[PDB]
Amino acid sequence: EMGQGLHTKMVQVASKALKIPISKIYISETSTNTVPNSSPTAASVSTDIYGQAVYEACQTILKRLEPFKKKNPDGSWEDWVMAAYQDRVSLSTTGFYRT
Amino acid sequence: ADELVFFVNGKKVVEKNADPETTLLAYLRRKLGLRGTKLGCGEGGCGACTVMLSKYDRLQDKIIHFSANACLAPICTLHHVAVTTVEGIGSTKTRLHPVQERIAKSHGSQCGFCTPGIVMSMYTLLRNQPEPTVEEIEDAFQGNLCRCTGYRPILQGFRTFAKSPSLFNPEEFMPLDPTQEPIFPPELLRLKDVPPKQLRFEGERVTWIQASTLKELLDLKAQHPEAKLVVGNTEIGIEMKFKNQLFPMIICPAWIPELNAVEHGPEGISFGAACALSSVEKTLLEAVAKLPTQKTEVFRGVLEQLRWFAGKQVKSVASLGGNIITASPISDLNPVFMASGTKLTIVSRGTRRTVPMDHTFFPSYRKTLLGPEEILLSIEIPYSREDEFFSAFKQASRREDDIAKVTCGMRVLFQPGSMQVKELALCYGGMADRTISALKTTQKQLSKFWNEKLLQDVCAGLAEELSLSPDAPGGMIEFRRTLTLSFFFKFYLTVLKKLGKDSKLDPTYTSATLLFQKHPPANIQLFQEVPNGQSKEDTVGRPLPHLAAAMQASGEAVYCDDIPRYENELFLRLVTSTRAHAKIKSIDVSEAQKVPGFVCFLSADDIPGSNETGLFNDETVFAKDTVTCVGHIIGAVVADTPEHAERAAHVVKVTYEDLPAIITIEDAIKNNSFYGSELKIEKGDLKKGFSEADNVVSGELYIGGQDHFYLETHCTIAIPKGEEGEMELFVSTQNAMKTQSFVAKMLGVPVNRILVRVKRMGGGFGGKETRSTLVSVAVALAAYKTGHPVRCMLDRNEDMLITGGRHPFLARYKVGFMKTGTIVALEVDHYSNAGNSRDLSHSIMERALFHMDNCYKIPNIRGTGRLCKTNLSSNTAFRGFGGPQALFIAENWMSEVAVTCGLPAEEVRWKNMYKEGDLTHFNQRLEGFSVPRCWDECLKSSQYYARKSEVDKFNKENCWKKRGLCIIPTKFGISFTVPFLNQAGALIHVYTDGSVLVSHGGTEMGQGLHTKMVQVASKALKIPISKIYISETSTNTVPNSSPTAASVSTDIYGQAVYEACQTILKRLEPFKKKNPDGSWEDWVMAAYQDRVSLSTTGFYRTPNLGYSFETNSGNAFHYFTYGVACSEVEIDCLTGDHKNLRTDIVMDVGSSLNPAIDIGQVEGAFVQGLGLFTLEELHYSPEGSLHTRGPSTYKIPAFGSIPTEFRVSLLRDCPNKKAIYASKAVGEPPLFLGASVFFAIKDAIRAARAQHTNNNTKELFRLDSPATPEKIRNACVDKFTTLCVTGAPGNCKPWSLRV
Amino acid sequence: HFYLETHCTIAIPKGEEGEMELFVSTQNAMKTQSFVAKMLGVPVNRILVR
Amino acid sequence: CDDIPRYENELFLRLVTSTRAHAKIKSIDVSEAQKVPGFVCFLSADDIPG
């Protein structure tokens, strides 16, 4: 983030893909021990590429949660997440994109 | 005066404003940035703060080197002294010193927190003696404690300095070359030619005067009689730090030549009052070697005591005058000086006098007959005369560095060439509020002869004269009275022997006159070599040393408090309850606010989110309205320095209104105070089982608790960012996930705002599985409220009081069996003391019930469990998690079954043992049950049967010493009792240079988890470990991690890492095929160039788990880890002390991923178990206040506590298809094997009772854990225990008695 | 460029295995990481850029 | 970046740069710099380990 609002846009994207309020999503920083071998933030394509990587990661999360959603349709995002955790389903994933 | 000048690692330090209260440890860590030296207790008993001191000794015209505890050394005593710390002898950045290389390569370092201190103790020895003997090496560590290793590897590695594959190769060790050691600072050698001058140092509250001459000292004392003298500061330091004392003016007379002079006169040897105990010891040793035996009786007595006096660090700084004048009731020297009439030369300005020490020198508690203006100048220890004999004995809880329970000096002078008493002096410590003489008793023997009648008369006299009220401080009334008589008996027999000329005494009584004698050590480790064709780069199965061992030996390894503080970082001190149960009527901070640097007092009302915390929302972050245990956290003080925070907190005034309290398990049962309902496992037909039984035995058993005593106490640093409630914390914890959620809950912010980072812990053992949050959440609140980073590291006494420990257990059992020894029925009701919150107590009781069978098949069985809710700090997880307690109870009744049946214990155990395929009491099938193999191999390698004969023979030839032998098996169910916690995640990144960064949910606490994970990743990826790295554990790399516990970390994280590696290999495949002859680096860059992600997660879930106590069905565990241990001991039937002669262990860890680490886990766990069952004991007042809050009173195993012959073998060819690379969890399983020592002891006790107690070969006497010297001695009932009695002795016989 | 905030770096040496953690005002954490590792002569996995 | 608090032992660096467009460095003298209070050290090419 250098003022262009990249993190803001990524939160907006993650919120739309996950179908939950932005209030439940947060981006703290950029670090080499979380996402390695990153290209420099430049060429105006950050929203383009990271937005896609965030989208994919979000899709993987939704897939892992689906069984629990279908199992409890009227529940909340919180219920599904806790159910998945207790059913020992990973709630962590990577996302990647290539133009 | 003002300027303090000294050197640290060759570098000159000029302190223009030295504060007398500043210790060397604080100065090193906070002012010089040398954090290699650690704080482990602050009371001189752990040696974690050990450093070396060097100085030019004018009286000897020589450079002397000695060790010292930096936590008790005032920097003001160091003018012109050269300090050497761990960083001063070597490092991984430059080159490791041989001492550091050997402890690292020999696997003598696990968590590493004690390593620098032990490194410096060894280093100091070598600077004094480059070629030490094995005995000198062991003795160098009388003052160093290690909780992880079991000590064996440290001693075995250092033993190379003296004069099946192997865990290490001595041949690769760099030789020691003293010519390459750092030189003594040239500048200091110049200053030696400059006559000393009086110095004055001014601190915040204290004024220190370093007196240079005797005249100055005397003038100062005349002008300031109240001024406290300080030499070693091993008493004053304790008084200032722990006793809320403050001495505004101190005078250090250490430099004065008359106070350091040694003179050999016609009547004895004189020592200046400032002489260190180590100097006295050296001088006396030389005297004993040069003078006739008949003249060194007293010297010999002094040496015997000095042998068990603290450790090398304390003895090298502790002065003679300090011990005599402190006049503590338990001084080990005053009884000797008093009994021998040691001459004391006392002086003041214008006056001089010499008086022999007698019973009058100590008027009352902590007082001597010195005038306020007088000082002790010198002491003359007398030569013994003809017909004069002396003895000195000491008995405590642990042999090394312990406080005397009873200590004595005894002298007898006979008429020329006769056995007729002319003079008799029996002086004791630990039997009153001062050193005393049994005058009334001894006076009656003058002119009497040394015979049986005298022995009887003296014992009855002592029993009457040295009485103790039931409320005597320190308790153990029966044990102490028995020691007073027992010591005399030993003296009596010793004198008969000495009178016997020799230049008779019943042969079976001789050993009673022998002083403790060390036996040569012998260690053997057997393990399996890896397959002949295995690549050198594949380290799985190899004894690869802990990856951080070298940095831990060099003091470069960073632990929480070692992290530098921000310039605006504040300190937090917890304010805790002093009442067990009461209402908080009011809190006054008026006084605290006056302390300099005070920032604020925080309490429940300051919490922005919720004050409800704990695993079961059972607790408060800060007490509200009421306190429920001594130590209950009420609030916290934040200040600019740790000292100011402590002083301010100490003056916070809380007004209470006591409420009825429930402390003990007995109290809880009586008041029906439990957490939840009864837990129970029942199988078979009990009613029927007891009906078929030939014999039935029922009883009660108790096992005391245990303090984790991780060398590094709890610690947290909280950094508030000031944005969106963000906070980053550095914490010494095994549970980053709960730390994160608990902090977020208290703050009232989303969990995604909190980052918890764990580098490593200097020990955890379960004590950091949950209780670390008590500090973390408090520190987080302080950071939130102030907006400043804040930190808090607990002092040992705070830690032991507040954080909880192992659960004490009370058991009521009833077992039915056949004359053959076969068990047919068993009922066991368990009760644990859980404390003021649930925490992990329920799961712990679950695991206990899961192991009430140990390795025996019981057709009909019923086990219940209840958690007692009491007003004591909440107890938690401790290596074993309830298993050790249940296993101990099991073995106890199993030992009673054998005795009752009159059959060999091992025979009875073997026939009741499970067999391959059997189902446990909770109905899980036992597949790959290896106990039989471990059992047979152990019996064989330990030569059990042959030694069983040696033991019997020894017992026939010895009346006051007995030996015991016992072989015990064990099985431990592997997996968290909570099914969903058996999950693990990993995150792996491969950078463009090919280097790999691995991250996983597990934390390092010294068990070598990261090392094993690196070994795993290296094998899976087929690349050298040199290209893989694990930096830390963090909640933003791997989320929702289970705590590093249940011994399954290697199992689950190994699988998660393995999976992540497979994904990486899959992605690199295309490029490997395109360029087959390329390097790992080539393929990685090609992948990157082709835009293939080199980052991935890994995850694992332990399959088919889920037991139910309702239906007694479902798999509780994934598999079991097994082992067997045989231990032999020797007990002193007269004192309670004992030797761990030999232990042989056969453990099944499947195909070990790293035999060095696993053997280390076996030895380490075994020693902690040994501690639990035989040495460690926590004492509480009736009102629930913990008495034992430091190493001085809580005795964990010491270097000298381990079995002299220590053999460990890893079962060969026993792969475990249930875990990563066929390995097995090893963390907790071996701990219970420590019970083999407990039962060997009970075996020895039975031999002693058969000798002097009853004749009933089937008698079943109760022996609770821990089997301490008190319990061992009291159990050895004899004419001495009988004379002392305890309640209504020969004193009160009832008027009538039913016929 | 005249970015209101000029170039800035904070480097924290850990003292273990060449480890270093840096807080940097940069659009290129990757090159910052490799360049620092290259200068120091340590593997890239030892350097953390935030 | 600079708003991040400094550690109590945190030091400060100031770059020493060329005042010439193209030239040979004949010699560097820090004798005067060493006199400034708080001076810790001057770093140059030879100090680079990698």
Ligand SMILES: Cc1cc2nc3c(=O)[nH]c(=O)nc-3n(C[C@H](O)[C@H](O)[C@H](O)COP(=O)(O)OP(=O)(O)OC[C@H]3O[C@@H](n4cnc5c(N)ncnc54)[C@H](O)[C@@H]3O)c2cc1C
């Ligand atoms: C870990 C540890 C283990 C210990 N173990 C033992 C033990 O096993 N047995 C035992 O008996 N003690 C033990 N101690 C107590 C202590 O080490 C001894 O009492 C020691 O000799 C104290 O001497 P010091 O020089 O450090 O005294 P300091 O603390 O420097 O002084 C003690 C007192 O003596 C006075 N004093 C000193 N010199 C003179 C003098 N010349 N004239 C008049 N007054 C003087 C002081 O004013 C002060 O009251 C232990 C202490 C620690 C910290």
Ligand SMILES: Nc1nc2c(c(=O)[nH]1)N[C@H]1C(S)=C(S)[C@@H](COP(=O)(O)O)O[C@H]1N2
């Ligand atoms: N040196 C050391 N070893 C240790 C500990 C420790 O704190 N220090 N904790 C123990 C406990 S209580 C457990 S549950 C495990 C955790 O490790 P693991 O699952 O990786 O084997 O190691 C054991 N071994």
Ligand SMILES: CC(C)(C)COc1ccc(-n2cc(C(=O)O)cn2)cc1C#N
């Ligand atoms: C209800 C809730 C999940 C909070 C309980 O939390 C726990 C319950 C049991 C255990 N635990 C089972 C073993 C063992 O079986 O060895 C060791 N630890 C850990 C936690 C944690 N954190």
Ligand code: MOS
């Ligand atoms: O690509 Mo923009 O950083 S010129």
Ligand code: MOS
């Ligand atoms: O599971 Mo260990 O932390 S008692």
Ligand code: FES
């Ligand atoms: S911290 Fe100094 S002896 Fe423990």
Ligand code: FES
């Ligand atoms: S290695 Fe010694 S206490 Fe941990």
Ligand SMILES: [Ca+2]
């Ligand atoms: Ca604890």
Ligand SMILES: [Ca+2]
């Ligand atoms: Ca509890």
